[PDB]
Symmetry: D2
Subunit: 116 residues, 4 copies
Amino acid sequence: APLMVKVLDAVRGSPAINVAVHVFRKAADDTWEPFASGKTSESGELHGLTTEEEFVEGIYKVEIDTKSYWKALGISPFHEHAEVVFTANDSGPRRYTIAALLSPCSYSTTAVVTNP
Amino acid sequence: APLMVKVLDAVRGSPAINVAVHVFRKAADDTWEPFASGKTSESGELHGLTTEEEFVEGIYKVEIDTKSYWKALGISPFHEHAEVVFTANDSGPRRYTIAALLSPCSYSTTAVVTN
Amino acid sequence: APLMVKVLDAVRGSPAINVAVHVFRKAADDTWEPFASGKTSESGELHGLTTEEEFVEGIYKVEIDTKSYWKALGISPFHEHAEVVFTANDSGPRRYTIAALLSPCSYSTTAVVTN
Amino acid sequence: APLMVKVLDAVRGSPAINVAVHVFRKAADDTWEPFASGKTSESGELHGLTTEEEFVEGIYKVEIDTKSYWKALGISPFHEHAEVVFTANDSGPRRYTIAALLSPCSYSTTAVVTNP
């Protein structure tokens, strides 16, 4: 897991399951290029997004589709999604976890970065 | 007032209104001495808790009755209450705001200390 | 003003002052149209961004320049910026406050919507 | 892990290591009785606090010693500790994770509850 995403639900006190996540990388021409995507498991985790070789230096955007999540639960939330943008691997390879906590009108995100 | 409390509701996206709050100060024997209390306003704020003269250095506890708040909304919450415990320290002019953000199974709190 | 932004610093326990904020509205072609911008005040607030007349229903993006903020404090942060994206919906009288709490490697945001 | 504690550091973007945690249970006479204690590992996790048999119904308090944590790092924080109080196992046994995110002037806590 060079790149992992973990999402919790603050209303249910449980993992946020079936959350769609799209990752983008900024291209040489300054637009967002699709990089990888997936959905969280029953444990609220999303592995297998990429590999060390493909996860090169760059500016990455991790979009967590919180609206589609609350909508699938029949709830009316506020945010379109939770967007996490960061430079990665500019000092060599690292392993990144993006952790997120969701409520209908609020979210928090945190990064855990470790050296392999 | 050197001490103020602000409470927000992360589910409804608004202030948390009519939430009971109890403040205590740690006594010499390590027990919690009632210090001040009230209910948050329409703005989720609790003003006039204390004065400069009464608010001396020491350890204080701010107890927020989150359980009753959630129950009144028809929701079963996790925590019995939310407790914020900190040291008040003279080291320049100061006003303490204890902010809290509530969800049924989570809460966050931050201290905003200004001159 | 139906839109206001409040920013706090979880490390120093105080408002985040002089932080650049840019607001954008989603255009028909799905691009982000500059809408309003400014720097937070001594209270960590950004008032007078827009008016009722200009603030119509739609999708808006609030971009907070957290990277420059941390760099000015001598700290290397994780995020390039903090982006808050939401739909403004008429469904009664409303005032939107977008609150954000910043740490070098984390941020949280809540919408406080009142009548 | 009937009871687990996980703690992250929002300044370093890493697990909060060597964090002391004390757990108490309210006794019949309404005072806080020591129940278990430990410190977080290099992964910021604390397992082995108790067993299903010993973790009976009751009101529990999980105290995370954030002051001793920031002090050990030579930092001046605000909170004495992060205190998490909850009723557990009143509908039969559950597995509880208390997750916490720490900054010098702020903390957030979340509960994840699952049925074994």
